[PDB]
Amino acid sequence: ASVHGTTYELLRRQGIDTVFGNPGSNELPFLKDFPEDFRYILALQEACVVGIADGYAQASRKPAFINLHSAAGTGNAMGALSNAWNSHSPLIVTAGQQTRAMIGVEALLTNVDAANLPRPLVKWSYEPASAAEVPHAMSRAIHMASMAPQGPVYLSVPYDDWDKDADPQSHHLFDRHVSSSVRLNDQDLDILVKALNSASNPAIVLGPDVDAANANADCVMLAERLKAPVWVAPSAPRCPFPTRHPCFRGLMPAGIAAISQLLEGHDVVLVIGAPVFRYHQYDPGQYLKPGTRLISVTCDPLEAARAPMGDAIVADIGAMASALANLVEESSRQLPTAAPEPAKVDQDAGRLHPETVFDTLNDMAPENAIYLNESTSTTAQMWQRLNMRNPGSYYFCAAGGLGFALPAAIGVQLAEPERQVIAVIGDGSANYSISALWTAAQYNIPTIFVIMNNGTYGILRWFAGVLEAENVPGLDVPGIDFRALAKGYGVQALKADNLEQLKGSLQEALSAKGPVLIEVSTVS
Amino acid sequence: ASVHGTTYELLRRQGIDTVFGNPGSNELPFLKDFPEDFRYILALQEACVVGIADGYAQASRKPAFINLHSAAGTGNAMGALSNAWNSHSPLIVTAGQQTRAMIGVEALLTNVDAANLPRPLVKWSYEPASAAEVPHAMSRAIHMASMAPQGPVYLSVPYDDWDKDADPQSHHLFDRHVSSSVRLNDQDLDILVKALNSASNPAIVLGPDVDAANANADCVMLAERLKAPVWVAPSAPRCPFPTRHPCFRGLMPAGIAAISQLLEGHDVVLVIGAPVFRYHQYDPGQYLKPGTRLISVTCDPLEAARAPMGDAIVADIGAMASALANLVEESSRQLPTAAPEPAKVDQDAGRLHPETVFDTLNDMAPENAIYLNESTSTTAQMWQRLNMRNPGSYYFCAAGGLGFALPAAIGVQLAEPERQVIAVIGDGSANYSISALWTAAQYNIPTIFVIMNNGTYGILRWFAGVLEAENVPGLDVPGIDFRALAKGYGVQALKADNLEQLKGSLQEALSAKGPVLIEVSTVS
Amino acid sequence: ASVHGTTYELLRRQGIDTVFGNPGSNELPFLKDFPEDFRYILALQEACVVGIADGYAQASRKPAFINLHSAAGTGNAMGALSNAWNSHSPLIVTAGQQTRAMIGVEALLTNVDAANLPRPLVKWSYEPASAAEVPHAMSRAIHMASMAPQGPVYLSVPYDDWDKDADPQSHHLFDRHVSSSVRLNDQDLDILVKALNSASNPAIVLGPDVDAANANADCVMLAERLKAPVWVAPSAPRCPFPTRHPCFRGLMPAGIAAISQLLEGHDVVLVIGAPVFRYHQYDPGQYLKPGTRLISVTCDPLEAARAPMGDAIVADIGAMASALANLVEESSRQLPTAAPEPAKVDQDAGRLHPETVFDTLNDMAPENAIYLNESTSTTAQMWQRLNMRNPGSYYFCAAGGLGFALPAAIGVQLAEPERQVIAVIGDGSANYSISALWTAAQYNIPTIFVIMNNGTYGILRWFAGVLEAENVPGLDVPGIDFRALAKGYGVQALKADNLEQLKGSLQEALSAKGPVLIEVSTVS
Numbered sequence A, B, C: 001a002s003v004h005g006t007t008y009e010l011l012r013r014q015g016i017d018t019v020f021g022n023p024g025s026n027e028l029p030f031l032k033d034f035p036e037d038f039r040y041i042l043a044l045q046e047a048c049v050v051g052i053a054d055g056y057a058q059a060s061r062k063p064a065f066i067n068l069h070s071a072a073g074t075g076n077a078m079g080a081l082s083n084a085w086n087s088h089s090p091l092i093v094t095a096g097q098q099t100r101a102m103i104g105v106e107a108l109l110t111n112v113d114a115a116n117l118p119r120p121l122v123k124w125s126y127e128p129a130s131a132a133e134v135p136h137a138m139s140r141a142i143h144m145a146s147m148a149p150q151g152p153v154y155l156s157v158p159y160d161d162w163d164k165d166a167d168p169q170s171h172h173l174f175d176r177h178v179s180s181s182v183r184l185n186d187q188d189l190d191i192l193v194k195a196l197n198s199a200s201n202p203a204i205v206l207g208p209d210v211d212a213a214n215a216n217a218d219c220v221m222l223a224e225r226l227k228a229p230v231w232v233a234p235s236a237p238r239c240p241f242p243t244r245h246p247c248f249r250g251l252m253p254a255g256i257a258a259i260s261q262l263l264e265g266h267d268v269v270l271v272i273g274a275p276v277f278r279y280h281q282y283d284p285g286q287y288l289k290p291g292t293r294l295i296s297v298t299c300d301p302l303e304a305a306r307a308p309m310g311d312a313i314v315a316d317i318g319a320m321a322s323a324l325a326n327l328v329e330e331s332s333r334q335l336p337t338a339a340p341e342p343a344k345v346d347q348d349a350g351r352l353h354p355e356t357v358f359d360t361l362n363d364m365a366p367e368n369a370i371y372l373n374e375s376t377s378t379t380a381q382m383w384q385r386l387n388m389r390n391p392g393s394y395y396f397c398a399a400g401g402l403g404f405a406l407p408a409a410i411g412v413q414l415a416e417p418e419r420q421v422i423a424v425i426g427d428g429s430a431n432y433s434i435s436a437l438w439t440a441a442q443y444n445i446p447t448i449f450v451i452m453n454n455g456t457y458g459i460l461r462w463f464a465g466v467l468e469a470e471n472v473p474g475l476d477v478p479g480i481d482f483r484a485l486a487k488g489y490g491v492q493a494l495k496a497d498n499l500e501q502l503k504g505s506l507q508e509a510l511s512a513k514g515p516v517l518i519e520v521s522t523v524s
């Protein structure tokens, strides 16, 4: 068989049946004779290709396969890869290279030093030394992306390789099963369980790898057993816990001092599936107060190594959460009391406060909605005002790289066709990957996009205020008509200039057959 | 003085007065107290920021300064950097990094292994080891970008460095002048001149570094003295010669066999300011036919090293072209045979043939128009049909990376306010950097964008055909309304569904006082 | 406290008490006030420093700390790092950098782009962005080196950092405990155990990570329970099993065809702690024959990904070996019969056959002797004729990089004061790291060095034959007097030109109280 034939057989045998791509001439020999059991999802720019694949991979909890064009295509996606790195997204990124005979002269479309291009944003990055090595390299890519800690990988393939004869012994690749589903050995696990049982005032902090592992339910049981309050680790890319569960305490502020203060009085703090910690603002102080001991379970050696405090255990989050949830004793302490329902902000008949938008979404959206956040000045309010009972209900750019939520919302909706996806995106963020709207239209993927339009890079204007930094250029983004942009890409568009119109538009969007964009006028 | 003050003083003393950017929190300490003698050009996505800066640098023939946001922002620009590398564009790319105190914990917005991120697409990439080093590192960036062979460079700066004290000895940086304006020594130059004078049938091939150096006029003199046919090297990023000058032969097809055929019979082929050669299609054969010797003058050691044939001289293109033009003897040979005229293609009253569009542009555009090309299936016809008689009249994505022409056309128009820029862009290419339109609207930069809408990735559909590649997915891009996209970003829009409307739209566009987009319905 | 003080406290609190080094001026500020509870081990060239540290880490099963001088010192050690990468040796490599103020001008002894230098041979490579970050970066280095899969790491430190004030919050680093002692979840481990219990003719293959984990005894129990034959994986860097145990089948030949033939008829092959496989010679064929399924347990995701066949489990070898050994049923199959003792080779009165040397070493050396092999042409004979009963009894350069065994033998001897180390080294290999001898003399480390002198690169001349390649230069190494070299570095030296002399010399060497070198005249 050919390299082409063998490679598609490997992909299908490893459960991959969808290619997210933007094609080029180096990729046509791969895409020719495209198998009928595969589906190709086209996006118009590579940041959108990778964003969509990323959302799809995160929601489906399986690897997603991407095909991009040489260096330029790969380069256009490297901002999207920064987010994918931070979210441990299992993305197999392939790119077409020039024919081997024209690589030396650096013909047009030659990806020079190809394996170095996406570094340091990938777990593994490779170009095979011969055509017959391609299926084996593809096998390496699949497993490197998929093993804990999951993450993006890169494979460059000269276009002339695909037609060449494959090694018959490549058949051994097709059904390989590779497992990382490991947990701490019994003796040391018992020691941990005893420390948890002995704690007088335990607290639990959860990160995105819990949601990725669908460990959420086991974490609920663990928190109920220990009678422990549960935070979400700062800069949260996902939601790992029911937000109206009585133990839930919400999103931790992303500051060193703020977090040690929050944890003061808790003798043992168990962190699961998060870096320790993804701080953001400068908030110097103690990493922990005395009296607090921290224990981290992480799937990522890099996270364990760089934590400035605490013990760490490097293992699969699913296997660890399950073991702990079922091993710890039921504490006789009183179960934590649910947090109070956020207060209703005063809302006149004018532009919308973001608190109003979220309250209204919470009132009207289905209970199994999935939200994406790229409205950076309103994240705190969103976490407080949306009741998200189920796993996989929230995504936020994991490296803070804008241009994620709009395409990712399309991939999520493709992954979960029975759960309504609602992306809340600021007017600034909306532009980074605006052309992804076209894919929603073309493939009939009925995502709802809520554009929070305040005319500015809100969070930047705010932080400039904190820095007392005056005369900063480039913070305002007036003059964008988002309904026109949606029309440009074939997506139904609505406007909401006040609360009444917001209710009406959301009602219409929820009932609509296709994707819908709502432009909301929000307060500056 | 502060690192901030010192750095801005270095920038002004070195001729920089414009910052192209998309701001982020790591960059706010740099952008605060923005000096009154600088201007900031905002674009909404980083591929757009870099593309605009690139156009501006290429047209102005001076370095352009860029400010991006950490890793995500840099990543979003890496497709644009692939073009900049191939075009030798002097781009100084700065990116903000987290505060030094929070780099180790990998806080949100930390650019991990920062200097490796843009490699291999930059000449130099660096993060300073202390705040006091920043002005020195900026000096190195300015000069590494500016020295032959010019190209993009990258500097990552922790945001806390700006307010720190600079080394007082940094004043020595301010007025440094660094020259690479060099040419071959007299003895060896005289040998080259003798070879040229002795040639019976010389030919000349010119590349983009001729237009970059404004060596066009000297090349015209050289060609006139030698009575030599002049080609433009393949995959041409710029136009180095007047396209209706009697010596001009056209754009070389980007194939090994094609080019050796074209050069057959020529005893000496002098190539100036081009790689040898930027081939593209697989077109195997001889690099040169017997009887032809090739001599290359290039500003780039990497070009000289990789040429698969001929001698090479690594020197400044401006200095070499000037010297050769004034030293060669005046040949009494007959000029090349007049080139044929492009045929007027058959055209009904419906959708427009690309040839019709170019013929109409050529009739109506000013003699000093500047064209950009990202209509990939129509390049050959464009070169045949446009009379471009002045330097700096043509730009095409140098690495074949789409998303260049739309933002670069804005940068060019900003650099050349008295020359009308006309960007001819395919419907596929248009989406990659669509948000750039906003910058043209906001700053009232009067670029004309001509969208060639045939509903497909035309050149891929063509190559699919020649490969006899069946069942290739993702080649069609129906359902985009470019007038609506333009409206979305505040740019006037027109439509041309036939020749009469094309003429009317162009008349209107040329009379406009701001940017205009014309959507042209072209054939499949 | 200073960075110096804080870092040494971190080191002692994490169990480090030895520094292997070759000093330079960038390193003096670190080495000054060297604490009384540490020892420094000097070697005269950096390949020797690292080889000694490597031996020490491998035998002690704990990380070894190294201090080298800038780029040149690090560079001199990169061959040794090649081996350390392949052996998963936990080496913390630190190198001194210029003072931060002089990095920018690239003063002499500046390590330019320092973190890139040791790539790709390190797990993690870094230079901190500030002095206060240094202790945290050292913490990261210790843990990256120590977590599965273990391996070398690199930290570059500007020499002026040591005297600066440390972050008081650095104390949180001192007692961090990081575990990767994990194994497959119960459900999937039961499936694996069932597959082993159900196997009709299983075989076991063991690699170096078994010996590194001291999982040898558990592997013996596992082999005895399953009544399975046991091979050592090809190109073996360590010995994971008693070589005279009845299940032992010896070292696998390093070829694809040879290994699948060896495993024919075995329905399940369990590979533990080895790459699949470290092939060497070209020996094309089937990876496995029909009827054989392979299951690999590996500590290294990179190994699991690249295996061309079989299932894989990525977990700690110690934890996995112990669990399997204790869960599998006692098979009723007959215990394998021990390999017969190898035949005696005919030995005349002249130069010695390697077979005779090994026979004689086996007869005279203590039962807990530790051997190192860098006699490349005699490896097979060595594995057959040396009875190694205990763990940690054999080391061979894991990447085939010569220069390992001489210095490593010193490190092992240092780590195991009560076990006699005997390095068997070819006359070719002996020169790579000859100066390591000085360290054995200076610290009175009683390693015995046995030099096999045949006056040639034996294995290369052999290979030259099978290749039918003639006129190959550089294969012969006449004119080396190893007794004089030993005298040069202060080590007692003996000669052996025949069997009687060999016996006498070995007898004196074992009785000696310091290092001894024996030059043996062996047959071509």
Ligand SMILES: Cc1ncc(Cn2c(C)c(CCOP(=O)(O)OP(=O)(O)O)sc2=O)c(N)n1
Binding pocket: A079, A374, A375, A376, A377, A378, A400, A401, A402, A403, A425, A426, A427, A428, A429, A430, A432, A454, A456, A457, A458, A459, A460, B022, B023, B024, B025, B069, B072, B073, B076
């Ligand atoms: C790719 C990229 N570019 C630039 C930034 C910098 N940035 C920028 C420009 C922000 C403002 C987002 O504006 P918005 O309107 O989307 O949201 P708010 O108005 O609520 O802040 S938040 C932020 O981090 C980024 N994070 N990622």
Ligand SMILES: Cc1ncc(Cn2c(C)c(CCOP(=O)(O)OP(=O)(O)O)sc2=O)c(N)n1
Binding pocket: A022, A023, A024, A025, A069, A072, A073, A076, B079, B374, B375, B376, B377, B378, B400, B401, B402, B403, B425, B426, B427, B428, B429, B430, B432, B454, B456, B457, B458, B459, B460
């Ligand atoms: C960033 C990027 N992505 C994808 C490609 C691959 N590509 C693609 C997708 C082309 C089709 C461009 O379509 P168009 O409509 O702009 O022009 P034509 O229809 O005349 O081909 S030409 C081409 O090289 C590329 N060169 N650069």
Ligand SMILES: Cc1ncc(Cn2c(C)c(CCOP(=O)(O)OP(=O)(O)O)sc2=O)c(N)n1
Binding pocket: C079, C374, C375, C376, C377, C378, C400, C401, C402, C403, C425, C426, C427, C428, C429, C430, C432, C454, C456, C457, C458, C459, C460
């Ligand atoms: C650092 C390094 N250099 C060169 C080689 C190549 N090489 C060389 C030069 C060998 C000959 C070793 O000769 P010896 O005398 O040590 O042993 P034999 O005579 O038994 O082969 S084996 C081998 O792989 C290597 N492996 N490592």
Ligand SMILES: [Mg+2]
Binding pocket: A426, A427, A428, A452, A453, A454, A455, A456, A457, A458
């Ligand atoms: Mg906004």
Ligand SMILES: [Mg+2]
Binding pocket: A116, A117, A118, A119, A120, B116, B117, B118, B119, B120
């Ligand atoms: Mg890179």
Ligand SMILES: [Mg+2]
Binding pocket: B426, B427, B428, B452, B453, B454, B455, B456, B457, B458
């Ligand atoms: Mg088109």
Ligand SMILES: [Mg+2]
Binding pocket: C426, C427, C428, C452, C453, C454, C455, C456, C457, C458
């Ligand atoms: Mg020898």
